[PDB]
Design a protein around this ligand. Sequence first.
Ligand SMILES: [Mg+2]
Ligand SMILES: [Mg+2]
Ligand SMILES: [Mg+2]
Ligand SMILES: [Mg+2]
Ligand SMILES: [Mg+2]
Ligand SMILES: [Mg+2]
Ligand SMILES: [Mg+2]
Ligand SMILES: [Mg+2]
Ligand SMILES: [Mg+2]
Ligand SMILES: [Mg+2]
Ligand SMILES: [Mg+2]
Ligand SMILES: [Mg+2]
Ligand SMILES: [Mg+2]
Ligand SMILES: [Mg+2]
Ligand SMILES: [Mg+2]
Ligand SMILES: [Mg+2]
Ligand SMILES: [Mg+2]
Ligand SMILES: [Mg+2]
Ligand SMILES: [Mg+2]
Ligand SMILES: [Mg+2]
Ligand SMILES: [Mg+2]
Ligand SMILES: [Mg+2]
Ligand SMILES: [Mg+2]
Ligand SMILES: [Mg+2]
Ligand SMILES: [Mg+2]
Ligand SMILES: [Mg+2]
Ligand SMILES: [Mg+2]
Ligand SMILES: [Mg+2]
Ligand SMILES: [Mg+2]
Ligand SMILES: [Mg+2]
Ligand SMILES: [Mg+2]
Ligand SMILES: [Mg+2]
Ligand SMILES: [Mg+2]
Lengths: 85, 205, 82, 80
Amino acid sequence: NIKSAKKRAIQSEKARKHNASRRSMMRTFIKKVYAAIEAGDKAAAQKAFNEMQPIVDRQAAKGLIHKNKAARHKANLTAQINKLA
Amino acid sequence: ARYLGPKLKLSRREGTDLFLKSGVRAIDTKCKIEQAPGQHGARKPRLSDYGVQLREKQKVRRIYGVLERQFRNYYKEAARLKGNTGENLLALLEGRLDNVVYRMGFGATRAEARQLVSHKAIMVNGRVVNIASYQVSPNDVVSIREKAKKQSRVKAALELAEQREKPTWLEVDAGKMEGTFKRKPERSDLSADINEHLIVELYSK
Amino acid sequence: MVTIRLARHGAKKRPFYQVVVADSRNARNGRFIERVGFFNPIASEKEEGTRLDLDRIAHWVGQGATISDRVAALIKEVNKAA
Amino acid sequence: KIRTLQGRVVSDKMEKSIVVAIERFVKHPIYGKFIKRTTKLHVHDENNECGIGDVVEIRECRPLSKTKSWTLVRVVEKAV
RNA sequence: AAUUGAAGAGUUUGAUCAUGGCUCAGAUUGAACGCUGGCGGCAGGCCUAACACAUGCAAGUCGAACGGUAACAGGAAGAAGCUUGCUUCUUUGCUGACGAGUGGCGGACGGGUGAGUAAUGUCUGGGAAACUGCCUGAUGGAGGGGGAUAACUACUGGAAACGGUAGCUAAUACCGCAUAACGUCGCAAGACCAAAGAGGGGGACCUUCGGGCCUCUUGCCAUCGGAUGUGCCCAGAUGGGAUUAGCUAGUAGGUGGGGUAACGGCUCACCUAGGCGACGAUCCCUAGCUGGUCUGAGAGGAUGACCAGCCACACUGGAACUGAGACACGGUCCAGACUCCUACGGGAGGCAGCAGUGGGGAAUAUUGCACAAUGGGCGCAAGCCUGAUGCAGCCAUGCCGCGUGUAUGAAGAAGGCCUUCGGGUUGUAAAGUACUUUCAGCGGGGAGGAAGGGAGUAAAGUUAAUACCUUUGCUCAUUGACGUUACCCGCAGAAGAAGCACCGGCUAACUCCGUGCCAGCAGCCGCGGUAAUACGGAGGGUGCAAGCGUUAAUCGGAAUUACUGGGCGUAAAGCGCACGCAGGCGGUUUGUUAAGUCAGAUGUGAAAUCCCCGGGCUCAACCUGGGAACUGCAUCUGAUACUGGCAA
Ligand SMILES: [Mg+2]
Ligand SMILES: [Mg+2]
Ligand SMILES: [Mg+2]
Ligand SMILES: [Mg+2]
Ligand SMILES: [Mg+2]
Ligand SMILES: [Mg+2]
Ligand SMILES: [Mg+2]
Ligand SMILES: [Mg+2]
Ligand SMILES: [Mg+2]
Ligand SMILES: [Mg+2]
Ligand SMILES: [Mg+2]
Ligand SMILES: [Mg+2]
Ligand SMILES: [Mg+2]
Ligand SMILES: [Mg+2]
Ligand SMILES: [Mg+2]
Ligand SMILES: [Mg+2]
Ligand SMILES: [Mg+2]
Ligand SMILES: [Mg+2]
Ligand SMILES: [Mg+2]
Ligand SMILES: [Mg+2]
Ligand SMILES: [Mg+2]
Ligand SMILES: [Mg+2]
Ligand SMILES: [Mg+2]
Ligand SMILES: [Mg+2]
Ligand SMILES: [Mg+2]
Ligand SMILES: [Mg+2]
Ligand SMILES: [Mg+2]
Ligand SMILES: [Mg+2]
Ligand SMILES: [Mg+2]
Ligand SMILES: [Mg+2]
Ligand SMILES: [Mg+2]
Ligand SMILES: [Mg+2]
Ligand SMILES: [Mg+2]
């Protein structure tokens, strides 16, 4: 409403869409992992982890999941896979 | 704020000279003092303890010409201070400037001594203090302003000032018209015919 | 960031500041961390008029506090050692 | 220990869901008489070991559950 | 030195003592009304409809991130106004600057309110599992690429709000790629993550004359700290009611998955069958909590404006997005209620920010001035913004100060009032006489609130450097909204400046006339039917004074909810009687324990307030230094007589 930082409104949408896509693509690669664990495939399970690890670590750096959120995911996944891998 | 009313009337009701026409003549008469403060003054005021208690403080008040509000605060300040509340009360009352101007003789009656104060015709430790209630402290030095010195009033003022018993706690010139509040008057100075503990009682309940 | 500044506990037309260390975001006379001096600008030439526990001010500026503009003057106006 | 609490058991009958009674006396803030103000606490005890009637020593840990912020330390006495 | 402070009266009776309510003297108020109303200082000012709101203003700023020129300012190869140095337009963004746009940081602060909330709250004291913008310590980073896009241009739809196509372009927007440890996962081996430039001045040397290069500044990335802010957990305390006694299925716990910055039924799946409750759950009613405020000798009682802390809310219900921080006070989205605009197709808005308006009410202010100060946002800065704030205006609403005159003035006038007519009274009061001029009026002069910033210059820190930059001096020209400021001097003339309640007793103050159980009074008793100190008027008096009365309201006196500090034979009060669960209490001895109790130490108990001693405004109110106090809570160590526990 009439006050300069209308700008801010339209700004936070540009932001919102940006983060929306990277935020999904990320949880996809995360999904691909839990998929293999439910399957049984230890290799695809590691294969999945090794391609998602960078993009999590990476997203965090960029700052839509800042720090430990990544950690937990790695930690969790790692346990799971070699729980029976 | 000032009483302003026919002032002998007071002394008459209060039964004693409050020195409010102070000026020339003494031991009143040439007035009527006593046996008819009104239209039934003639009558015997056989009166309650409350009344004798009431009239005492009234007397003290009509004397320094202080209105209820201020007097109360005097009492309260008196009581706050350690020492006999009633003495402390009497102390504060005397500490009044206007009073310590009439008392140094520069003014006929306290009323007059006051008009002087309010008319910026006085100076404590050099500086002009025109408020009647300016409390004065030991070693203080109240003078008359050079402007309007030895002018009318202030002569006869410093005159019969010597007719009076005359202080002790204050030394005072008469040529310069300066003078020094040397100490806080003691109980034994002033008084006799005033009864603190009554007007402590009036304000105790 | 924390800051050293003047709170104005004066009194219409005769200001008298407290000097305080506080979260710069708070109100000029609000919540503070500790008091570290005072500054009467009507001091009068008589006696006092700008007492100022330096060795604390010190401490906080060590811990990262910024100083006002006025306060900065006062410190460089207290002189410092004499 | 940074402080410890004693208290009797009161309820053992639940997979580690141990609850302990604590008893203080306190001066009534108004009529000065001393009364019993009791406190119950939900304490953890891995591999269930205390029993109804046991005196027990207890300490304040972080949240083990919405309810539990205390584990036990030692036991004392039994068969009340 | 520093809480060292406590009073009673009226009224049941013919009278009495007791019992017991009613009433009164006192403090206090964000008050209202009635009469009256002079000046100033500080303060207070919608208590009601968390009713509804016209209009202005309450959040921006940065060109030293970016492409930039549309406005106005200059300058420019060059075209000119020409009156040959003064200068006009075409243009040219060339730089001073700057609308619009991208980007950055702030719009989570400051300011409003008390609705909801008896606990995601608050107060006290603690705890472990977390994040933390700007500021700050340390250590290294800062390579090399890529595709976009707003603006703008063209075309185009709308009354407006605001859009549709197609191009076109920069960066501190955005994404890969490199690099990757004292970081993250991992027992390890290993694997994996980042970034941005922008200015200022400058010797060679020289370059595509834009700059490289040197140099300092500032921003950018990473990790570990600090500092602060915030999240979370425990215990105790923090209203009322049983004419509410039972409550509970994510309910209580476990195991695992998931989730959060973080512990966690936070969530899920599965298992256990628990969890709360008369030490008052559940239900209902009311309510923001604190510091403190009023009162009281205390203990208490009452209370939560103004100041400060916390919480919570932002038209109503619900949501999330952005972000370090929000589920956002002047942001977004949905639903609702309601209002405005319109060309009828569609749009827009939320004062519990400041002022103001309608409405409600016994009642609560100006649509003001200024960023000068202090404080906040942004900027290297200059500065810009700031209804925070500093001031001003309104109201006796309160506190405090002051004035409205001072002396003199008698047989004491006049008039009024009472009178046994002798006289008394109003009353030194008036008049008259001298004198003073505070305040308001008028005229002169004139502090402080002002630090800083601007240029110069000087030295020092750097560097290639004497440039820049930063720091510290020196001078010079400066910067106040308030403001006709405070305060000071002169001027005139007592000149402009007194009212309200009361006078039967309580309770200070008495007579006359009128009236006649009428008119009327009244806090309580109770006054009024012919001599009314009680009605109404008058004279006189008492009390307070720019106030005075009335009403409303808290506590006090009320030992009248009695903990301190009370009662139940006959005055209010022993259940018609018994038995007994819970609960309370419990003879006597030794040992043990150390919970109650006691002792010490440590920490904490925000600042303001209160109080003691001072200090500053001519005093005071007011302002301020420093103490004292906060009677509390917790931790540790001790003491063992008493109480509690265990034993015999
Ligand atoms: Mg897990
Ligand atoms: Mg007054
Ligand atoms: Mg009788
Ligand atoms: Mg009027
Ligand atoms: Mg611009
Ligand atoms: Mg409410
Ligand atoms: Mg970036
Ligand atoms: Mg990489
Ligand atoms: Mg790059
Ligand atoms: Mg779990
Ligand atoms: Mg009492
Ligand atoms: Mg307010
Ligand atoms: Mg909402
Ligand atoms: Mg977020
Ligand atoms: Mg609003
Ligand atoms: Mg308003
Ligand atoms: Mg009305
Ligand atoms: Mg305001
Ligand atoms: Mg006569
Ligand atoms: Mg004047
Ligand atoms: Mg000045
Ligand atoms: Mg100065
Ligand atoms: Mg009487
Ligand atoms: Mg009357
Ligand atoms: Mg009569
Ligand atoms: Mg009582
Ligand atoms: Mg009794
Ligand atoms: Mg009876
Ligand atoms: Mg019986
Ligand atoms: Mg015994
Ligand atoms: Mg304190
Ligand atoms: Mg003083
Ligand atoms: Mg024993």
